[PDB]
Design a protein around this ligand. Structure first.
Ligand SMILES: [Mg+2]
Ligand SMILES: [Zn+2]
Ligand SMILES: [Zn+2]
Lengths: 98, 86, 50, 100, 205, 69, 126, 100, 132, 81
DNA sequence: ATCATTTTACTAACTGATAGCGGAACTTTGGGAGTAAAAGAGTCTCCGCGAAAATGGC
DNA sequence: GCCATTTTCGGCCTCTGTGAAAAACTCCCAAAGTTCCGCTATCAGTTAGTAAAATGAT
């Protein structure tokens, strides 16, 4: 199996799972630990943001690759926004200070 | 963009500040038109339009009317992704 | 309910052996085929049987 | 989609010096994810160097491995400099060679 | 809900009739409970009369299956109900309760149905790149025209502007009338159909 | 730039209308007619001659070039 | 194993309160007490006295200053309730918090980047 | 609440919990409008409290509310917590593109 | 999860504390030698020659194979080396108190997530685990 | 082509700093119009930057110096306008 | 350099069509009130888990 | 200080739709919905006509 871009989850806005759904591989906790041990910060950021759930970031990355500029503009994962909305729904004020 | 995450109790005024409206009915969608019901759990007047730059009426159905609230329904003409934030 | 017509198509696929296929005996010795070597590169006995 | 020959030449030029990431589950230690230079082969199975098998705890009895493509220049250089197999020949747990 | 119905029954009881309280109160309690079930038992609310129609259809289906030993067919149910078959099918297609997204899928327990639902409203990045390329190609092709016809087409189609314009507003800026704008757009379309400057735009079809 | 209609050589309205006399078809025929015929028409003039020769230069040809085709 | 044992020995119970903003019988981080003692010594004021406590890996993990990592580890309900009642602030100083919020981890190639930001912080706070 | 193939609809348990909360709140308002006997009002307030608790954290107060699957409904606390929760299934680990 | 926050943040914290290192003895024979334990550690106080005041190995020097052979030839019994536990760094540890990074062979670089490496190294072999 | 990033880490000292410097150089050569200081030999920008670092032509000092130089030159040119 | 002609730029008009908006009337749907023998305490099954720690009660 | 009841935890990949039961009619009224017709805005298609610019011939 192999996937570059395809369907995405309805809620988490993440690539689906399985060959039947043309889905992508899971970069689990152990993989994140291995990348952190290597010191590979940029590869980890690529997997987290512009490959999984940064809706604007992944589209910008696709356009940039098509036009030759292999650069990314990382954003905020949609999963963190879902977590924020859930915690606010539990009657707890969680907010990002600036 | 942000340097810290602050947690704490939520005041009723803060909860009202978050909210874009009050859900008054347990209705979700019509059983025939499959459209959101007013003042329900899926209301387009509170949470946003179901189609991009459209209103439930269909009167405002293009981008020139962005940010305009339809008088017949009250649905703001904007993107559907606001239904993930509102 | 709501279904008008169902058309089912049956496809027969001939799958040949290739590298990556799992082959095993009856004694727990399983393996994955690594190379499809030519006949001339196989070991052969005194009678020429590879 | 039509799979022309010039497309194959373009693919060969694309992956020339583009590192690729190979990962085997479970990733007990950081040696379970490494960077390699791809070589196009005719088949459907990933060909792996024997000497990294001890690093991957991998044997060829039905094992499957996942592959990832670093996109940005920073990620490619991270794979080439830190995560390449030629750099990871000492065990971080003890310092003894791992490609024995 | 039965307590509310009992309150109503108390509010409109008559002891002069000589009947016991339970006789009158049971009707109101049953009405309240049945109406509450019809109104608040489904995620997608079905009106009360349609709920009664579904229930009576189920009762007749039960009786007919008992009578003949097999599942009644839509036509026979329509004949027995003295109702059109199309209405029977319409009623049969709406008696479904939504399935939960947390239901385990297959024989597994850590997998859920909600992980297999796509986001069909999303735009594929290939489509967005094609849109950007089409914008660039349209700009390049329109740059090969005189400013008059290029801007006439731009304003008549809304390219690089918020709103589309009819012939009158296009004519007003040029101070010319509508018919000249129409033939200007016709000339631009005829010129852009020439294959000398339309091969790049053809690949988008 | 083999045998293809004369509309493809993007000729102006007057140029095309004049040559619309059916005294030509396909650019292979046009390249062979020389200035003798090109200026013979009372409607093909100096500017039309220059424009046609510029189009043929874009085609890499000169008016009057002799080819067996 | 010594990098694990150091993580175990991260808390201290205050024995002598001193003039620092610490109460007797309070379990607080050792680094904060060390900085407070250095500041008090520079100010010529009575420093604090602490008794270091040994905690298991689970209790030390759940006793971190950042509540995002503690919630992500386990027992999200207790961590979130305590953070909400206390009004805690997450400064995003570890790997897990930056992974969750999608920023560069303060390890390896992100280290200098994070360092730069901290410098700017101080320079603006001036 | 999105349609599946065949006309079926897929819904989250949060919809059911919110519907229960809204129904009980509206019933409480109607009872207070009718000058109800005290016992019914106390029962309605208990039901409202139970619905809110089930919406926030199901099973902590008492018997977990179950739907038409004879299985407990998933609340916000269950959605943010656990091995299958958001933190460990979607934040610390993700499914990625450009992978095989 | 308990060691993810340990990152090498400085080069030297300027501390004089350290841990004592001697060959591990469990009877009449050695179990592990001093060379194995001292390989890759930074010296805390000078390794004086036995019965002599000559500074054989000065302070703040990594013990590589050459100095390990030197120590073995001199027959030095007890030494003192810097340790992560005794580090004075406010956040994380310093390069000298950690020592050689085993996966590279040189002194540990700035920004190395040594805690994750330590946790993985300890946890990976868990499957293999069960007077004269 | 090149393998075994040894010479580069010897010239730089830290692998992460080397990665950052090589990334900056590769971005300059790819996105920008900057040309390579060594024969390309059909190599990708990352490999060319790594080779330049190995040869000692590119360090952090050089990159920051010429970047400040470009800012100064652009300021002077805008003043000239 | 100058004249005569074709093409160009700009008005008007007719044909024919099509989509959108508003009003009248009819059928379909949807919400609500009412039902008078009397009937006047729930489920609802399970429970095949162990080990360690954090809170009340005395 | 010591029981005694709660609380929370239990490895990483890949495929892999479910659930299925369950009990009312009847009458009245207003609003949404379907269909039809008329008026109006807008446009594609075509022709004619007039005044002027481009252009070729001399
Ligand atoms: Mg195996
Ligand atoms: Zn509207
Ligand atoms: Zn130190």
């Amino acid at each position: 199996h192999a996937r570059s871009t395809g369907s995405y989850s309805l809620v988490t806005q993440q690539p689906l799972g399985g060959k039947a759904q043309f889905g992508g591989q899971r970069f689990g906790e152990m993989e994140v630990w291995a990348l952190e041990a290597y010191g590979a910060a940029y590869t980890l950021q690529e997997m987290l943001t512009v490959k999984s759930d940064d809706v604007n970031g992944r589209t910008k990355m696709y356009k940039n690759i098509v036009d030759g500029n292999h650069a990314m503009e990382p954003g905020m994962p949609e999963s963190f926004n879902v977590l924020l909305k859930e915690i606010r729904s539990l009657g707890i004020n969680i907010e990002l200070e600036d | 963009e942000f340097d810290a995450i602050k947690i704490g109790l939520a005041s009723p005024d803060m909860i009202r500040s978050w909210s874009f409206g009050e859900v008054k009915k347990p209705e979700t969608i019509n059983y025939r038109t499959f459209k959101p019901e007013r003042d329900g759990l899926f209301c387009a007047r509170i949470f946003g339009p179901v189609k991009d730059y459209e209103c439930l009426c269909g009167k405002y159905k293009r981008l020139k009317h962005r940010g305009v609230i339809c008088e017949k329904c009250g649905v703001e003409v904007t993107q559907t992704k606001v239904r993930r934030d509102r | 309910p709501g279904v008008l017509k169902i058309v089912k198509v049956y496809l027969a696929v001939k799958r040949r052996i290739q590298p990556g296929d799992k082959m095993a005996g009856r004694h727990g010795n399983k393996g994955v085929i690594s190379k499809i070597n030519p006949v001339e590169d196989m070991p052969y006995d005194e009678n020429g049987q590879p | 989609e039509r799979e022309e020959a010039v497309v194959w030449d373009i693919l060969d030029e694309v992956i020339r010096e583009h590192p690729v990431l190979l990962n085997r589950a479970p990733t007990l230690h950081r040696l379970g994810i490494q960077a390699f230079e791809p070589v196009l082969i005719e088949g459907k199975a990933i060909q792996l160097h024997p000497l990294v098998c001890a690093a991957y705890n991998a044997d060829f009895d039905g094992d499957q491995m996942a592959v990832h493509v670093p996109l940005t220049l920073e990620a490619q250089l991270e794979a080439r400099t830190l995560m390449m197999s030629t750099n990871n020949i000492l065990s971080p747990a003890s310092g003894d060679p791992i490609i024995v | 809900e039965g307590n509310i119905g009992l309150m109503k029954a108390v509010d409109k009881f008559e002891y002069r009739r000589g009947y016991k309280f339970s006789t009158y109160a049971t009707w109101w309690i049953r009405q309240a409970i049945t109406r509450s079930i019809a109104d608040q038992a489904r995620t997608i609310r079905i009106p009360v009369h349609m709920i009664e129609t579904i229930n009576k259809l189920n009762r007749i289906s039960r009786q007919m299956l008992q009578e003949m030993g097999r599942e009644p067919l839509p036509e026979e149910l329509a004949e027995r109900m003295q109702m059109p078959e199309d209405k029977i099918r319409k009623v049969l297609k709406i008696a479904k309760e939504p399935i939960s997204m947390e239901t385990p899928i297959g024989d597994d327990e850590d997998s859920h149905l909600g992980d297999f639902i796509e986001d069909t409203t999303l735009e594929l990045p290939l489509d967005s790149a094609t849109a950007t390329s089409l914008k660039a190609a349209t700009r390049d092709v329109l740059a090969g025209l005189t400013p008059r016809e290029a801007k006439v087409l731009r304003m008549r189609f809304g390219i690089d502007m918020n709103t589309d314009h009819t012939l009158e507003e296009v004519g007003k800026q040029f101070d010319v009338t509508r018919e000249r704008i129409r033939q200007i757009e016709a000339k631009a379309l005829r010129k852009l159909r020439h294959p000398s400057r339309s091969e790049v735009l053809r690949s988008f079809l | 730039i083999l045998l293809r209609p004369v509309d493809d050589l993007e000729l102006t309205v007057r140029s095309a209308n004049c040559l619309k006399a059916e005294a030509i078809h396909y650019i292979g025929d046009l390249v062979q007619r020389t200035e003798v015929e090109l200026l013979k028409t009372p409607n093909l003039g100096k500017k039309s001659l220059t424009e046609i020769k510029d189009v043929l230069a874009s085609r890499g040809l000169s008016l009057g070039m002799r080819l067996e085709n | 194993i010594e990098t694990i044992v150091r993580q175990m020995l991260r808390k201290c119970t205050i024995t002598f309160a001193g003039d620092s903003e610490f109460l007797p019988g309070e379990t607080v981080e050792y680094s904060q007490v060390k900085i407070a003692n250095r500041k008090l010594v520079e100010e010529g004021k009575e420093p604090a006295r602490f008794e270091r406590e040994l905690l298991g890996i689970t209790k030390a993990s759940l006793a971190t200053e950042s509540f995002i990592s503690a919630a992500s580890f386990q027992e999200t309900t207790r961590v979130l309730t305590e953070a909400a009642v206390s009004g805690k602030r997450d400064d995003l100083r570890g790997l897990k918090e930056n992974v969750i919020v999608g920023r560069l981890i303060p390890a390896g190639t992100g280290f200098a980047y994070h360092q730069d930001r901290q410098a700017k912080r101080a320079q603006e706070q001036q | 609440l999105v349609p599946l193939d065949g006309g079926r609809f897929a819904t989250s348990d949060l919809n059911d919990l919110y519907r229960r909360v809204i129904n009980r709140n509206n019933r409480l308002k109607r009872l207070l409008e009718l000058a109800a006997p005290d016992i019914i009002v106390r029962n309605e307030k208990r039901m409202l409290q139970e619905s809110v608790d089930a919406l926030l954290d199901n099973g902590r107060r008492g018997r977990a509310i179950t739907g038409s699957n004879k299985r407990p409904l998933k609340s916000l606390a269950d959605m943010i917590k656990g091995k299958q929760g958001r933190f460990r299934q979607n934040l610390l680990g993700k499914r990625v593109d450009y992978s095989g | 999860d308990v060691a993810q926050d340990v990152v090498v943040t400085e080069h030297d914290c300027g501390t004089l504390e350290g841990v004592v290192m001697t060959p591990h003895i469990e009877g009449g024979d050695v179990k592990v030698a001093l060379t194995e334990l001292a390989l890759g550690r930074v010296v805390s106080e000078d390794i004086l020659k036995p019965g002599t005041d000559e500074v054989l190995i000065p302070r703040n020097t990594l013990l590589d194979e050459k100095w390990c052979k030197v120590i073995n030839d001199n027959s030095v019994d007890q030494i003192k080396v810097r340790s992560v536990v005794t580090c004075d760094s406010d956040f994380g540890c310093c390069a000298q108190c950690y020592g050689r990074d085993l996966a590279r062979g040189h002194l540990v670089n700035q920004g190395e997530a040594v805690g994750v490496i330590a946790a993985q190294s300890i946890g990976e072999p868990g499957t293999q685990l069960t007077i004269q | 082509a090149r393998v075994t990033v040894q010479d580069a880490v010897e010239k730089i000292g830290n692998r992460f700093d080397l990665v950052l410097v090589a990334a900056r150089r590769a971005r300059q050569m790819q996105s920008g119009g900057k040309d390579a200081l060594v024969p390309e030999e059909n190599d990708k920008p990352t490999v060319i930057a790594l080779r330049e670092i190995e040869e000692g032509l590119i360090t952090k000092d050089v990159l920051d110096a010429r970047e400040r130089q470009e800012q100064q030159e652009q300021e002077a040119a805008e003043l000239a306008a």
